[PDB]
Design a protein around this ligand. Structure first.
Ligand SMILES: Nc1ncnc2c1ncn2[C@@H]1O[C@H](COP(=O)(O)O)[C@@H](O)[C@H]1O
Ligand SMILES: Nc1ncnc2c1ncn2[C@@H]1O[C@H](COP(=O)(O)O)[C@@H](O)[C@H]1O
Ligand SMILES: Nc1ncnc2c1ncn2[C@@H]1O[C@H](COP(=O)(O)O)[C@@H](O)[C@H]1O
Ligand SMILES: Nc1ncnc2c1ncn2[C@@H]1O[C@H](COP(=O)(O)O)[C@@H](O)[C@H]1O
Lengths: 489, 489, 489, 489
């Protein structure tokens, strides 16, 4: 049985208003299933359940919370193929990706945080004589999490792993475009023994369920991943009760290839950086910044590789690139081909739907490479979020850095060089939360992930995530302080 | 010579529009001086100066940022008397307090952060074989800081200590009601060698300079201490560029006295907690929560102490309590006495201006103790922010806890008992960022200070403040990762 | 099949000289089995195997080392009954203790360190401009571990958990008196996938296998638990190659009962503190230090409880206390009854073997309580290591502290009081690595465990253990330091 | 007035036996002065004083201990020229080096630790429900420190900075060869307000004062820097009371130059690495390991630079290299020149005293460069500790690594290359506590410094030094643990 209902207080249930949403398969636009569609009243029920569960969940020994997460990681791995199939069906990710990347990264992140739960420690502060001052890292309470459609399975672990490990209870609103793997995950949570109310899943529209969750007076923190524009609306919503906010927003990642780069490695790395996940990744290498000396040779080979990518049915293990996750998103991406040409950009390959008649009803676009004239051009500035890379050239390291920092974003970045000093100097100077040298999109559940500036704030992963999901509770005991009276009598 | 101008890019300067504000002495309403009144255009010049200075300030070794803060601490101590006099003149703080508390706490916090600058360390993450992942704690950039009028001198250290130590440049908007000590502090900063543009001071109205600072696109973080309402406006303003936000908003601190307390210590503690600084402290012990068996005995002594407090001219060394800082605030506090009586509270002492004719022109109110009918009464819920304490009684530990947590605030808290288990159990369960046991208002520059819920987020002091004034910069080096091509050919 | 051979390089093997050691059941003195008896040559083979395995084990991603430990914890839990039966057979621990304490503590500690493996992080140091300095916590290499007979199963986890998680390989010499559970643990390690050579177990005499392991030039650290006198010999042995040393040595724990203690709780706590594990615990509460006001009432009840303890066959689930682990150890304990009487001590209960004829061939002694006249008496100074507690009385808190600190040991300690100040003050002033308030012998795999002074140095458990099983590796990159020549030309 | 007596309990005093030692000027063999010669009885007096002082020193707020170290740093800087002159007179270091390096590094280290004192924090461990477990980092007590003659002034700070910051009291035995600057340091300590007994200085012979200090039952830790043989003797002495031990025991540092190195930087780096301080540095780059393709080129320039180094009177600011510190050490270095030639090494420059007759009575030797026939030759294996470098060549990275790791030492190391992967890969694989890339001998008071294997254990500098100068004190409070009785009745 594929689960399709909301999950509130340990049960699968219909939405209060009995609404549904059609969930589509991006390979052919067919209806996979209808899901229950959470609205404000459902979010209220979910927050109520999380509130009731919080005292017992936070009071549970940290090792006990940890153990549940470990059991969940094992269960995810035991269900790898079914979860991969479901994620591919819903998202359009090639089955080879959901098998090799989506499922294992999800399990690995839950396993990490299972081991992390009882490794977060408080502190003892050296203060005045006769005083003891201990500081706990206490959970916040009920945390609300809003997740987009590009890595829905993976994001269950990135969001919930630290939140739960830290002793918070959760209301998570996954994308209504791709909600199916998230409902399976919570089903597994119940199976391994998560208590009722600790995790509540409320798929529904952003403007119904998402808005209520961000505004809710009983929620202590809202975590959001998506567009910079929607990020602003999350911040606006947080004013009501001054809930804490975490934001992972746009990127327009530079992928810089210097003239001493290993071209083999860099060409493959560039293709990985932008075409993996159909470019639907906030850290995609969407700006390919090529040293003038190697640019022609790089592009000859990179264009040939891109043109060869096998586009097709996500469920075929031979498929290398799937469709985009929605029709609207496909049109968004194609529209940027027109934008690019109007500003004198050259389309080196792709920029249209594939020919194959078997793909005619899916949201497919060919890998697209455009060379732009200036780093200020629209396609060099605006997030396309598809398999679409904009090429720029440079001479000096200073030029490469200026290009890298030329946008409104600062999420990921990376560069290919074999010069020791350059690697570290560039990495320090690029405006980004993450910089990959001679690799790209390396993620690890202990390695802090997030942005600077308009790319948001807060970090997923590691001790950083645990810090962001707890609050300092400072306690002072006056043992022998011998404090003189302030008003002497 | 008393400085009265804006401090921008290393120089004292008039405001662009040449506006001024009158700074009053609360002892008598006299105009001490005009100051230059910063508006948006001055904030822009200040942010520009800070932006220009940031690269060289951030590139300075941490130890040498630290040395400057160390030298500043020494310079403050060397100027103790003159600084104390100026603070007392502006704020109404008794000279005995500005000498013993305001100046020393300010010096201690700068000294702490001077030693802290090169103690903040990054991390190295264990990741896949053949990869090196190091994480720096980099400064944010230009940080904006808005501070109120109750501890202006001390706030310079609480705000600027961590921000500067961490490598940020600063634009600070002190209260236009009490700006004078902050201008002397930045003059000392220049004297000890702070580079031009690293610290910029722009006193002006909230709605001119403050609003622009919070909205400014060149500012990476805004820190605000003051009212909940205004805190919401700071949040709203942050949307433009998604700058990070730190908020310290109201408190309504419970001060709980159990029947096994050392009453001598607790009585003195209670008087310190609410009457020090004329009650103008976010962490004031404004709700005195007394066990029924000892409430009458406690009050008889506490009321006698309170009625004896010597109210008078701040510059008199015998003065124990000064005036409130502004006419507006005094009227507010007197309004709450009326409210208290209106809702059936019993004013046990105080509630009106002192009799002494010499004090007729100043913003004086006597220490005020009111016993409230209910924990839901206005004076038991709303921040009065004056030398005004509301008394409530309880029997059981559970009722003490319920009272303690019955407000919209969660900043500080404390309790007096000699029972081991009760002390730790109550401390864990009270909604507050700080809990003092057998003491109150203990502050130390290493001990994290801030609130939960609508009292805000972020922490002053310690490693916590350094974390909130830096960002994670994760760098990955592929040394020997041997990453297979994603598109195999 | 019960394993009895050495475990070297992934296989169970006989000893080079083909020697054996008889393993006795302390309930009746019968030979359970013969084990292979390691000598110096076998230690050499084990070190060689650990040396060969070290590069691949340390190069393994920390998460993959951690996963092995997690799997081992699960395997131990799945085999709780058989492991408990085996430990009880060999050690004399009541089966109810091996089921409820020995097995679960072993699993919990291995699980903790499995989670810990990829949570240990390096650091990045703020240094001169243009330099990058990162510091790794690298494993030491091959570590030797020598473990006594009182908690042999539990000690496998306490020693091997941090060592392995940190990326060291291990040669462990368990006690030849109680080696059987350790050989089962290593077999489980092989089953869950630990590589050959990573863990090597060499049961044999201290003076053959132990001495060679301590002296071995290829071993980078030796960890020892046991007597202070043998610890000296470990230190001596370490001179050869200046290997690192960790020591947990004698204890003579004070268990202090103030006149405001919960007597119910403290009487039960005292019995647990000394009679659990037949008092064969370094942290046993072997000095019961009683406030004069409560001493008579406490003793009447404590003596009644002690004399009611059900002594019997360890394999009966009704048994509350088993025999001591060896004949020679029984005689040590009994000899101290004579010592106690000669210095005018009074035996309140026990001090002889039980009467039950079924127990005649086992190493059984009744729970023994002696009241000594002075804290300087032999039975108040010398470690007895059996179910033998020495009572002293006191008046003031200062005398209780003086008594507590009157021995040559400093391992564990504890006290029973309800006074908040006293509890923290005493805990700070007592010479010990651990102090339990209103409890005793609380152990947790994150909570550092070890002594001060002659009780040794280093810590089991937590991040402290990880620090002690790694070494700092500092790497400096001069990116842009621009260092002027020292000899200017 | 040059102080020459022992410093014990706040006072300069003669030795109990009234013995003295002659302190020589290495420029001319002349007697600077006689110093008091501590023997065992004086060590006893010093440890007694430190024991008496410990309770009040450890009880002082951390910030107050910190403030004293901060003041000391300033006083050192205020006395730069006189300290530099005294250090140069006693040690032979060129005045330019004592001014630019010895004094500033000493001040910087005390300043770092003065700021560190109140930054070391304890922990709160997540444990069973209803228990609070906090862990303090408490000082050890009285610590003994034994220091050689090569950087005597700097060693005062490296040793005493962390020990004092952490709350220990100190008995320091400086080298009797170069005791004078240490006696001035402790005089400054008294001047800035260090309490009597907190720091005690006992210059005397190793076999009288040093041996007693290492054996003393009142000393909780001994820290020793010097020869391997003497380190073994320290270890042996530690057995008495099982005091903690720290050892820094020499080096035979590889300085590897790859064929892609910046030769200008590397030639200057090599000269600094071995000729600074006359090669009397345990981290000296004493093995120059050169890639075959650049070896001849490098050596032609390096030999020319070395031959040009200006040898002469330490008091002349034009002097670049002074004499060795003692006649005995000079004879040892001259003997190693003979050894080098005996084994077929090629002396490329130096190897004997300079001919200038004004230097005839001093312990002078010219910068000496020997190309060795094999990496196993004596001068390629044994510490010469003079301005003496042994050259070896290689052809693959693996050969360079094999050479690097071919000695019995593992203290410092470094390499010069511009290949990114090689830099980090080689740094990870070299057996050493420290690895410098494109630089050498970079030391910072936050960057841990120490060896592996026979080079010792423990670390100077940073949080690492603070850890090694404290002990974990774990306190458990049973608040609401609800522990069932073990013996159910
Ligand atoms: N106004 C909104 N409030 C809350 N959530 C939203 C809003 N708009 C979209 N979302 C959700 O946020 C995720 C991504 O939105 P976007 O930032 O527009 O990429 C999806 O899961 C949406 O359901
Ligand atoms: N709209 C505003 N935006 C920014 N700052 C303000 C605003 N209104 C007042 N402030 C400043 O915030 C501090 C405390 O404000 P409040 O909490 O409104 O009393 C003072 O320095 C005020 O000048
Ligand atoms: N001289 C020794 N050297 C090394 N290990 C020993 C020595 N004597 C005993 N052991 C082992 O260390 C543990 C406890 O020894 P002890 O503390 O002397 O009773 C047991 O496992 C012994 O086999
Ligand atoms: N047996 C010893 N015990 C303790 N310290 C010594 C001993 N012999 C020499 N020292 C001291 O250790 C430092 C370095 O000595 P060494 O390594 O023997 O050259 C000097 O301050 C010596 O005086």
């Amino acid at each position: 049985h594929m689960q399709t209902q909301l999950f509130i207080d340990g049960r699968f249930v219909d939405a209060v208003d009995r609404g549904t949403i059609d969930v589509l398969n991006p390979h052919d636009g067919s209806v996979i299933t209808k899901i229950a569609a959470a609205t404000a009243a459902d979010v209220d029920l979910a927050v109520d359940a999380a509130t009731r569960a919080f005292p017992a969940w936070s009071a549970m020994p940290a090792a006990e919370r940890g153990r549940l997460l470990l059991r969940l990681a094992d269960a995810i791995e035991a269900n790898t193929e079914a979860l991969a199939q479901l994620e591919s069906l819903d998202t359009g990710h090639p089955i080879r990706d959901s098998r090799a990347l989506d499922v294992p990264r999800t399990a690995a992140c839950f396993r990490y945080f299972g081991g992390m739960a009882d490794k977060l420690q408080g502190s003892v502060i050296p203060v005045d004589t006769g005083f003891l001052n201990y500081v706990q890292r206490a959970p916040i309470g009920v945390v609300g999490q809003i997740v987009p459609w590009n890595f829905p399975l993976m994001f269950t672990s990135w969001k919930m792993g630290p939140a739960l490990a830290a002793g918070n209870t959760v209301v998570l609103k996954p994308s209504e475009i791709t909600p199916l793997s998230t409902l399976r995950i919570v089903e597994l949570m119940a199976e391994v023994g998560f208590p009722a109310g600790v995790v509540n899943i409320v798929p529904g529209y952003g403007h119904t369920a998402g808005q209520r969750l961000a505004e809710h007076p009983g929620v202590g923190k809202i975590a959001f991943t998506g567009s910079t524009a929607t990020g602003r609306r999350i911040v606006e919503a947080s004013q009501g009760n001054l809930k804490r906010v975490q934001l992972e927003l746009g990127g327009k990642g530079a992928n810089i290839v210097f003239d001493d780069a290993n071209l083999d490695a860099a060409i493959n790395g560039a293709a990985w950086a932008i075409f993996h996940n159909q470019g639907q990744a906030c850290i995609a290498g969407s700006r390919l910044v090529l040293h003038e000396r190697i640019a022609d040779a790089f592009l000859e080979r990179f264009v040939a590789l891109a043109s060869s990518i096998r586009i097709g049915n996500p469920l075929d293990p031979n498929t290398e690139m799937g469709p985009l996750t929605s029709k609207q998103h496909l049109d968004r991406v194609l529209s940027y081909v027109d934008v690019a040409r109007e500003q004198g950009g050259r389309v080196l390959t792709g920029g249209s739907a594939p020919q194959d008649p078997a793909l005619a009803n899916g949201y497919y676009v060919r890998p697209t490479i455009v060379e732009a004239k200036h780093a200020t051009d629209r396609v060099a500035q605006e997030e396309v979020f598809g398999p679409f890379v904009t090429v720029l050239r440079f001479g000096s390291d200073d030029e490469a850095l200026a290009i890298a920092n030329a946008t409104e974003y600062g999420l990921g970045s990376g560069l290919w060089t074999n010069d020791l000093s350059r690697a570290h100097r560039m990495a320090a100077r690029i405006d980004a939360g993450m910089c990959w040298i001679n690799c790209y999109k390396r993620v690890n559940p202990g390695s802090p992930f997030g942005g600077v500036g308009k790319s948001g704030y807060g970090r997923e992963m590691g001790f950083e995530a645990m810090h962001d999901y707890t609050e300092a509770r400072s306690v002072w005991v006056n043992v022998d302080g011998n404090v003189p009276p302030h008003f002497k009598r």
